[PDB]
Symmetry: C3
Amino acid sequence: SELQDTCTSLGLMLSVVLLMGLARVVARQQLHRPVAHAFVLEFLATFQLCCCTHELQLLSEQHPAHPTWTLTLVYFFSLVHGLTLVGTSSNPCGVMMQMMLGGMSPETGAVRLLAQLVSALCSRYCTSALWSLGLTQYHVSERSFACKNPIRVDLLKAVITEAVCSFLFHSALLHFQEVRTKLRIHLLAALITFLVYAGGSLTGAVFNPALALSLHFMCFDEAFPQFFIVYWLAPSLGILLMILMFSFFLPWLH
Amino acid sequence: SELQDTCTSLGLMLSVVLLMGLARVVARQQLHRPVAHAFVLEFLATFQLCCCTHELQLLSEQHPAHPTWTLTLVYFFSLVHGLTLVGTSSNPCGVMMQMMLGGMSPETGAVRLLAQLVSALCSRYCTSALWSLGLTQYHVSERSFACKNPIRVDLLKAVITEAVCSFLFHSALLHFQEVRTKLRIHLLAALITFLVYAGGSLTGAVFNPALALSLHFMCFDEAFPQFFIVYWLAPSLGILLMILMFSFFLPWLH
Amino acid sequence: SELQDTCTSLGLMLSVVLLMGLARVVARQQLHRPVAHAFVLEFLATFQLCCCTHELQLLSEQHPAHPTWTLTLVYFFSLVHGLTLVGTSSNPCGVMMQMMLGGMSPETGAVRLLAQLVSALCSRYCTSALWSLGLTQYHVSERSFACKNPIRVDLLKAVITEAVCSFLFHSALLHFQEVRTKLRIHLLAALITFLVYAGGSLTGAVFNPALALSLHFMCFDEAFPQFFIVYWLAPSLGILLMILMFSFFLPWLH
Ligand SMILES: CCCCCCCCCC
Ligand SMILES: CCCCCCCCCC
Ligand SMILES: CCCCCCCCCC
């Protein structure tokens, strides 16, 4: 059973990576509107990131005796996302950073933000639509779209965790811009793995409002402000701390 | 209580970073003597590193159920030190490396070493002077300036830990000189976090004679040679191993 | 006893690094045949990597209460191998990568593969020949050349672990080619440490057919196909996945 349970989980994620890769190839051959192409690529990139993260989290909770096993898979798939999702953010907090600490206009930023939000809801539905066709034994429940409360620490602790992780990732994302592309993807994948390892036991270390929407949508519906604070406000506060540090403090300090 | 306990701890460290940042700005505007400016900046940089590390260690022991939570804060503040303390070492072992494996003259090296030692004692006093004004509930004890014996492993194990960590950090510090500044700070912050994670449970992973003086001054007074060996001799032995490896062995090997 | 037990373990590894360093220097002064020089250097590099890994694993199992202590030593010696074993692979899977995803001819690749295999068997014999002269208390058993079954996870889990680790390391090895040499060695040492930390509790995280031959030769003899699948097939499958990803998928995707 576990032989079929594990193979199906990896197979679906590799299927999704190939399926969104083909969709990117197809879109790149019949989408000559720059705004429309920006929307579709962001929709595909967010869908891949959400579905793979959904499967990775489900794999982890089915394998509690080997926490280090999923850590390598988290690194592997973070590296895969970097190599295949070039030119996208798949993160609303990343879009605010490029609009504020960068040259991204609000016109293209609004389209990317919308594409991420539609993809996050679509990824959850496809996540719920999948796992209902049979396949894995644990997929039969399909999580029953039941809130699991990813955050167990206090409200203040979770906000600090998400703000610091958002600050740590996006500052590196901003500071690795001039770095060689191949090296940068490996560095960001390593940083993502550390943040997940550091924050996964406390908050889940999402620092991604769109990804948190797909993972914990039913948690959001039950208690909106508490989840909206931890996963939408706190990561956005890490981006604001980058503005204060890298636009006001450091330029004046040096 | 824990909501006020945690907020005060972060608030003080961010206060110190801003307060030493302003002092650096003020010093940079009224200190035209190059030797005097070198002393003050090293005093401010060592004070910030000692006070933040004091608060981080105190936060960690108050939060034993979430060891990964402090790990992100350790990374965050290591990154902050790299961004704000440019041009300083805040490490006596780093000064020996620049005097020996570098062009730093003993004239400027002696001033930096003194500034670190005055700052380490001043940081401890300000650490003891603080926490006595009330503020946090656990601050009321203010650690009671009581030896906590940071090293529990055998004497040989702790010496190896401090020598290897000093070798690992300072070799990277030497080898990341040509690396882009923004990338280098992120890499050294990650390395610091690993060494603290790897060595914190055994020695504390200081590899910094000045920082160890502030953290464990009362431990030093009770048993000097044992702490002087682990925290002053062993880190200095890691620098010597770098001289043997990178000046004698490797040049002859290649 | 443990003071002598630990000092002997570090002393032998540093002795081997110096002894293979001198042999490399001697070979570089009396070997004018390029094929012969390629064989000897690969034999010396594989011997150093196998013997140090043998001692590191033996140190780790003698020190179960301080798992983080050996992690720093694993990083330290991985960094040492990078600095002293320049121009070699010490990995059969690395040789396939250079023959397939690179310009290494099969003529020089076959000599390197043979040199690794002779060294792995010679390292095991010298490992068994050593520890029989007395020295450490735990060396007296000298592991009794008894199978320890490094893999406890299921067959499917171990194959995934070795394939992913081989993919993760060798893709970074391929993508760090243009990176500065000094930075690259530090990055690969960090990646090796993570893979060992991530995979050591499940498989041992070898992703090195030659190294696995020396470590678990008696395990190989007892149950060949099961160990040949995990340590020879699975790492070679990670290299094949790199070919599919970096020669077929990514070029067509972008
Ligand atoms: C602790 C989990 C994350 C560790 C990542 C280390 C990667 C090294 C640089 C590629
Ligand atoms: C920025 C490179 C990745 C950071 C990983 C640091 C891990 C340290 C704690 C294990
Ligand atoms: C030099 C970059 C930081 C090194 C971190 C390695 C962590 C490996 C064990 C988790």
